[PDB]
């Protein structure tokens, strides 16, 4: 197109196109800011899901053994002048080991040794009786 009329149409179309491009430049930039804004919130939410699951795991693994131990001693417990004094002597010994765990963090193995001691002495007191 070399005509002076065609060329004026051209300048109109090109001027329109440019305007439609200034729009898309700022609109798509607007959409970028939005998308970025959401990436930050997407990444935070996923971070928090890792964080909470870790807080939980860190906590459970410290205390579950101590609950389990507690239960073990607590079950044992559930299971006239001479016999009673020898057995009440065990309940009190149990409630003591049960208060020990409820009052001081201790390893499953430590709990286990104490528990084993309670079982042996207790089997001998329920075998005689």
């Amino acid at each position: 197109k070399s005509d002076p009329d065609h060329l004026a149409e051209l300048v109109k179309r090109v001027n329109h196109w440019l305007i439609c491009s200034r729009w898309k430049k700022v609109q798509w930039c607007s959409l970028s800011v939005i998308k970025l804004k959401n990436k930050i919130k997407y990444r935070a939410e996923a971070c928090i899901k890792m964080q909470k699951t870790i807080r939980m795991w860190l906590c459970k693994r410290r205390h579950k053994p101590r609950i389990d131990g507690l239960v073990k001693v607590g079950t044992l417990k559930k299971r006239k002048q001479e016999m009673s004094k020898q057995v009440k002597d065990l309940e009190i010994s149990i409630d003591a080991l049960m208060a020990k765990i409820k009052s001081t963090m201790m390893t499953r193995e430590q709990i286990q040794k104490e528990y084993d001691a309670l079982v042996k002495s207790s089997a001998v007191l329920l075998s005689a009786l």
Binding site: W23, K24, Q27, W28, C29, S30, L31, S32, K39, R43
Partner: protein
Amino acid sequence: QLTEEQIAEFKEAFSLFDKDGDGTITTKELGTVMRSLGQNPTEAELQDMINEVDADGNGTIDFPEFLTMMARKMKDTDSEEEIREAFRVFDKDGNGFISAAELRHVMTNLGEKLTDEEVDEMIREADIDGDGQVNYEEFVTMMTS
């Protein structure tokens, strides 16, 4: 998935971030543009965004990285909702229409230099239904162009 046309609309948007034309950006330009469009990212949030895509650890990133940075597993209604928030960055006062004053507000924050007559050139070109404003349908049509 992005079509080449969309990447190209995006490449243009990138130029508002990468003002100096070297083809790369830092959290500095990330935060500047974002803040000028209403957002309030913290430095920590910006630094993290970068880390995900800053392969060579330069602290600097480029256009393909900039695009991956904007990606994430989205929901069903999420694309449409983002277009709506993009609208509401212009329609700041939430009446459902972009007016000239509102267009200029954004153009000024982004630092575009233009005369009041050009801004009206812009409203006029997008204003299909001819009411002196820009509704959501028309803004979308323009974005799509």
